[PDB]
């Protein structure tokens, strides 16, 4: 009945840290701290229910324990174990959960081999070096990701502008043919080939230019399609690096356990 040894008592922990622990956990996962007030003999229990982290205060009086005005239990371990067995429905009918799963302070020490203090004097330094390198690559990817993203919308609006210019030159062709047709036909029977060739010379120069901007559009749609492709590649690369980066952070961070197994920063001083 040692509250100090109990699986679920982490103690000197912040609201932010317990939120980082019950994130997306199943209903019934629970955890206990001493109150954020840091007042001695005052505690708080958090448990997962309905996608939320619902906090309840454990009152303390005359050595007894509990979390309501009628107070009963001798120790917090008796209070917790009671609600591990049967439901909190006894306290709130809208709180049908039991204290099903704890999360404990030293059930996840993933150091395997002989505990030479090189576990922190070497392996921790390696993992941290492996983390800051992969974190520097992900920051670089996000930079050219945002750069590429912004160059793309510049190109999308530019081909969309080419679409309007070509739409205008194409209706210039259809109006040239609409209004020139019967002047061409009138000139044909007057025998005035000179005037017909002025009209043709101008029409040819119109569709000559429209070819130049049509070619300029596809030459830009080519750059776009090829830049849009490497944009999708930068994205899937980030999505591959993100889970690894998270795996390595939690690995590095939990290898600070063995700095706590000395208990003082004299060890990471070597890495300073």
């Amino acid at each position: 009945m040692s509250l100090q040894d109990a699986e679920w008592y982490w103690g000197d922990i912040s609201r932010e840290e317990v939120n980082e622990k019950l994130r997306d956990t199943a209903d019934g996962t629970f955890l206990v701290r001493d109150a954020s007030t840091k007042m001695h003999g005052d505690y708080t229990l958090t448990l997962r229910k309905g996608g939320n982290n619902k906090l309840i205060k454990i009152f303390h009086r005359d050595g007894k324990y509990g979390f309501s005005d009628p107070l009963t239990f001798s120790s917090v371990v008796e209070l917790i174990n009671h609600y591990r067995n049967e439901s909190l429905a006894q306290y709130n009918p809208k709180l049908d959960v039991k204290l099903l799963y704890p999360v404990s302070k030293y059930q996840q020490d993933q150091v395997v081999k002989e505990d030479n203090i090189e576990a922190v004097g070497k392996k921790l330094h390696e993992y941290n070096t492996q983390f800051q390198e992969k974190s520097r690559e992900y920051d670089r990817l996000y930079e050219e990701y945002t750069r590429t993203s912004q160059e793309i919308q510049m190109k999308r609006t530019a081909i969309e502008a080419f679409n309007e210019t070509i739409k205008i030159f194409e209706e210039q062709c259809q109006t040239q043919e609409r209004y020139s047709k019967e002047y061409i036909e009138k000139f044909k029977r007057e025998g005035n080939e000179k005037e017909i060739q002025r009209i043709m010379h101008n029409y040819d120069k119109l569709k000559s230019r429209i070819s130049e901007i049509i070619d300029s559009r596809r030459r830009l749609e080519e750059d776009l399609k090829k830049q849009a492709a490497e944009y999708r590649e930068i994205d899937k690369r980030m999505n591959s690096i993100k889970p690894d980066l998270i795996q390595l952070r939690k690995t590095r961070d939990q290898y600070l356990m063995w700095l706590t197994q000395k208990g003082v920063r004299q060890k990471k001083l070597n890495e300073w």
Partner: protein
């Protein structure tokens, strides 16, 4: 627009334009770069006679030009006065057409488009009916504001353009009153006489609470001293001048117009504080009204024309949603095992029910076709319920870890309070940098307009008819159906109102509040706590809660603003918060909190809401807040998550702000020219020398069109400051690697010499400035708190403004140096050590004589202010080149964003050099009585800010949706709860800070 043509900075002096006639002919016209379209059209039809089928052309006057802009708009050039090179053409061509539609409207829409940075016609194409209804339905807010400010013309118009810059209370704190001569202030009134614009002054002594008309009375009374006037003849000329003249601040465009007590005007409230002389200019009212050209407000075309249901509370079924399939998912098939979509039903940030996920699925076939069931009743859905979802990947082994790929949020009710039904498809947004939560419930609701982005398809239950949220009528009756003093509990309820907005509130405490919810209206401050206690997935409790907020006592704005943050999405709650503002928030405090009030627009569930109508109403009735209203919105147009909402909001503003739109466009062009200049220095001259960049700058700024754009416009940092001619002699590039511009203008005011004769600003392109804006704003709040309590701690919240994506303006503060710069002015003492006294000696050299004691007092007070401020905000560990000091002795910190980026060890910088000057150059300076009363200033300043901890927590909370990486979750705000030690009471927080001050001393 990056240049006058696509991919080109400037047009050559002469270029060829492809002119397309209304007959089929195409004519190449050589024309000057600066040629006005009137010159183009005339010389084109003059050249057209050389081409076939001229007979078909009507008269030149019957046509206008149309072309394509670099924004991809087919723009009809009605304003034929514009230079060819100002059109922002995509390619150099012009299509001749007969004009159609309203000329004046098309001319005005172009000016609006240039102001907001996007064409207005793009809004015309939007299918979404919410957008089209918004454009029409806020024009009445525009009409109200325009009608109101043209009511008592011209005075009402002057009050709109030149509003009183006044403090929120006439009451002086007696440390300000003590710098008055037995309650009186000495003021000098100036006049210009025309024959050669000669100055003359009149010095007056008056009660500090005189109104401007009474000042004009004492001035004319002092000049008629020897005119032998009767009591009634004196009245007649007092009446003549009181009604014929007004007072203006010498050197800037601030005017005294609305009979506030003179000491309540901020200019004079500071002249007292600084003990400086208030210089006023007597000016004719007809001259002031002369520079107020009339400005109408035409209703736009879209304003007028356009070409059964059952209640949510009858749907006896649980909520379910069908997830169909995804698209464009960018995932590596052999590094990622499987994908799935995660979903949750949220009311604000609290899940209304447990989350549910689809099955896991191969990356190569993102298809689910699953109905997801949610543990909530459809009648139990609150009005502000939202669906938050994302596509997630998994990698397995060590633990299996999940990561989000793209996210998206949906309002389960639309702006017509109908429940969504049928198939739906929304493009998802990129996961913001640093966010690792599988969902993003604080993100905006809506589909991503960017193309080739992951598109997720869904389907909602189509019940036999359209479903709508119940009208308030039946909600109150359901409260009547559902519902079917004490002492010791009273002290606890009050004991909970004290606790900050982010204090831990356990289950026993929140349902204890819900129990005594009816007693809570006796302590209205408890409303935010009580609202978080409501079980919003119960229609019983929500209905009962609506009845309480309907009759809730007004809380003051500093508390009402919390109810606009992302934790209070209910429309009835937010409507109560707005009503608190529009009846208790002064234009002064609105202007102060405008940054946060603009950001909370992002949390608004729909485009049309009570908040935006309030801000828009105030932005059109007060041009000072309308100026920054525009720029804070304009500064975020790049962000496509809000570019539509802010765009529609700017359109309505620019359509009703009056002739001030003309001035904004001159600012926008000036900034655009400075942007394009700095982009050339960044992108095209990285590989070239410092002196080469300089020669291009002077040459580039020497061009006529540049100077005509950069000379003669209002400063965006303070539009009261006119920016006249450039002192090119003094402009320069700067050493920073992002190479910003040091710019300097002359002050064209007739009496500029009485304020400042040249005004200099740093324009920087590349750095995100909203960090410095928010920090400088927060420093100005803290100084305002200290001043009103009686702590004369002088801070220097210099001007800073973001105008776009990583670009903006910083006010240079004259006669100031960095501490590093000042150490380099002295010598070495220890082996390669700078002399610690070099700062105190530079202070002495700059403040010889009796003014010495004042400088030490100013340094010690400003130093105490920043020591406390920087500690609280986690800004302490600054470099000597990031701390500055005026010759005056005033100390201030700079480049706050540079420090946050550098982060990715001391509570605050209290270096020995500062202790030398604080203690006036004494030995063991930590034991003198100057230092004794210095650390006591810091203590009082610290607990003063803790006494207002709620305000700051709320201001930072309102910034979460901003996109600033420093503010992505409430956990980020928890740091200030540590420095303010809010979970500990006063004496503990005091000792906690005293301890940090010993650590800042680096010993004790």
């Amino acid at each position: 627009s990056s240049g006058e043509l696509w991919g080109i900075h400037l047009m050559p002096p002469r270029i060829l334009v492809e002119c397309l006639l209304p007959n089929g002919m195409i004519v190449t016209l050589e024309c000057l770069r600066e040629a006005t379209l009137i010159t183009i059209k005339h010389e084109l039809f003059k050249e057209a006679r050389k081409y076939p089928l001229h007979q078909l052309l009507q008269d030149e006057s019957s046509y206008i030009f149309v072309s394509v802009t670099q924004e991809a708009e087919r723009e009809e050039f009605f304003d034929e006065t514009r230079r060819l090179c100002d059109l922002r053409l995509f390619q150099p061509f012009l299509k001749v057409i007969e004009p159609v539609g309203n000329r004046e409207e098309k001319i005005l829409n172009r000016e609006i488009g240039f102001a907001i940075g996007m064409p207005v016609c793009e809004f015309d194409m939007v299918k979404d009916p919410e957008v089209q209804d918004f454009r029409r339905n806020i024009l009445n807010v525009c009409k109200e504001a325009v009608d109101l400010r043209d009511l008592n013309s011209p005075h009402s118009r002057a009050m709109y353009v030149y509003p009183p810059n006044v403090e929120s209370s006439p009451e002086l704190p007696k440390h300000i009153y003590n710098k008055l001569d037995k309650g009186q202030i000495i003021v000098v009134i100036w006049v210009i006489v025309s024959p050669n614009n000669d100055k003359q002054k009149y010095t007056l002594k008056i009660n500090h609470d005189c109104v401007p008309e009474q000042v004009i009375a004492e001035a004319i009374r002092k000049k008629t001293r020897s005119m032998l006037l009767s009591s009634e003849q004196l009245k007649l000329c007092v009446l003549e001048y009181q009604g014929k003249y007004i007072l203006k601040v010498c050197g800037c465009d601030e005017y005294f117009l609305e009979k506030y007590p003179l000491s309540q005007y901020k200019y004079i409230r500071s002249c007292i504080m600084l003990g400086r002389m208030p210089n006023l200019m007597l000016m004719a009212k007809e001259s002031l009204y002369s520079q107020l050209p009339m400005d109408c407000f035409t209703m736009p075309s879209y304003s007028r024309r356009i070409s059964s249901t059952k209640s949510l509370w009858v749907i006896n079924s649980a909520l379910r949603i069908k997830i169909l399939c995804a698209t464009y998912v960018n995932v590596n098939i052999r590094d990622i095992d499987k994908i799935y979509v995660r979903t949750g039903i949220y009311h604000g940030g609290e899940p209304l029910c447990d989350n549910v996920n689809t099955q896991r699925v191969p990356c190569s076939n993102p298809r689910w076709n699953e109905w997801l069931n949610y543990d909530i009743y459809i009648p139990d859905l609150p009005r502000a319920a939202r669906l938050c979802l994302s596509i997630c990947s998994v990698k397995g082994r060590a633990k299996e870890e999940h990561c989000p790929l793209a996210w998206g949020n949906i309002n389960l009710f639309d702006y017509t309070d109908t429940l969504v039904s049928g198939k739906m498809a929304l493009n998802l947004w990129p996961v913001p940098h640093g966010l690792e939560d599988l969902l993003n419930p604080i993100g905006v609701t809506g589909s991503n307009p960017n193309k080739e982005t992951p598109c997720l398809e869904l389907e909602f239950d189509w019940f036999s008819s359209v479903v709508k949220f119940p009208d308030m009528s039946v909600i109150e009756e359901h409260a009547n159906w559902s519902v079917s003093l004490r002492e010791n509990d009273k002290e606890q309820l009050k004991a909970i109102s004290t606790r900050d907005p982010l204090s831990e509130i356990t289950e026993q405490e929140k349902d204890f509040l819900w129990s005594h919810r009816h007693y809570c209206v006796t302590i209205p401050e408890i409303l935010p706590k009580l609202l978080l206690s409501v079980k919003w997935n119960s229609r019983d409790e929500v209905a009962q809660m609506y009845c309480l907020v309907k009759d809730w006592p007004p809380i003051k704005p500093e508390q009402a603003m919390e109810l606009l943050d992302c934790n209070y999405p209910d429309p009835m709650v937010r409507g109560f918060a707005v009503r608190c503002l529009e009846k208790y928030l002064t234009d002064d405090k609105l202007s102060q909190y405008l940054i946060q009030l603009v950001q909370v627009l992002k949390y608004e569930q729909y485009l049309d809401n009570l908040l935006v109508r309030f801000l828009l109403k105030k932005a059109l009735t007060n041009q000072r807040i309308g100026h920054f209203f525009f720029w804070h919105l304009k500064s975020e147009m790049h962000n496509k998550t809000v570019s539509q909402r802010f765009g529609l909001l700017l359109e309505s503003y620019c359509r009703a702000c009056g002739m001030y739109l003309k001035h904004l466009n001159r600012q926008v062009e000036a900034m655009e020219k400075l942007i394009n200049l700095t982009d050339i220095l960044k992108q095209e001259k990285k590989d070239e020398t410092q002196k080469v960049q300089m020669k291009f700058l002077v040459e580039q700024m020497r061009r006529p069109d540049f100077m005509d754009a950069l000379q003669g416009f209002l400063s965006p940092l303070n539009p009261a400051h006119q920016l006249g001619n450039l002192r090119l002699e003094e402009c320069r590039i700067m050493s920073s690697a992002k190479r910003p511009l040091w710019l300097n203008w002359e002050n064209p005011d007739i009496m500029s010499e009485l304020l400042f004769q040249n005004n200099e600003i740093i324009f920087k392109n590349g750095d995100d400035l909203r960090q410095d804006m928010l920090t400088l704003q927060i420093i100005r709040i803290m100084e305002n708190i200290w001043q009103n309590q009686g702590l004369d701690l002088r801070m220097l919240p210099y001007g800073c403004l973001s105008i776009g994506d990583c670009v903006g303006l910083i006010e240079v503060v004259r006669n100031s140096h960095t501490i590093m710069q000042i150490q380099c002015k002295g010598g070495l003492k220890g082996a390669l050590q700078f002399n610690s006294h070099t700062l105190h000696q530079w202070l002495k050299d700059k403040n010889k004589g009796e003014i010495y004691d004042a400088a030490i007092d100013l340094f010690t007070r400003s130093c105490a202010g920043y020591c406390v401020a920087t500690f609280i905000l986690g800004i302490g560990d600054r470099h000597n080149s990031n701390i500055m000091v005026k010759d005056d002795g005033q100390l201030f910190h700079i480049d706050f964003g540079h420090f946050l980026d550098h982060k990715k060890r001391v509570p605050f910088v209290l270096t020995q050099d500062f202790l030398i000057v604080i203690s006036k150059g004494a030995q063991e300076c930590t034991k003198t009585r100057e230092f004794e009363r210095f650390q006591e200033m810091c203590y009082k300043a610290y607990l003063a800010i803790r006494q207002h901890a709620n305000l700051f927590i709320n201001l930072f909370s309102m910034m979460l949706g901003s996109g600033m990486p420093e503010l992505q979750s409430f956990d980020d705000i928890a740091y200030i709860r540590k420095t303010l030690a809010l979970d500990k009471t006063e004496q503990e927080a005091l000792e906690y800070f005293m301890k940090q001050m010993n650590d800042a001393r680096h010993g004790g």
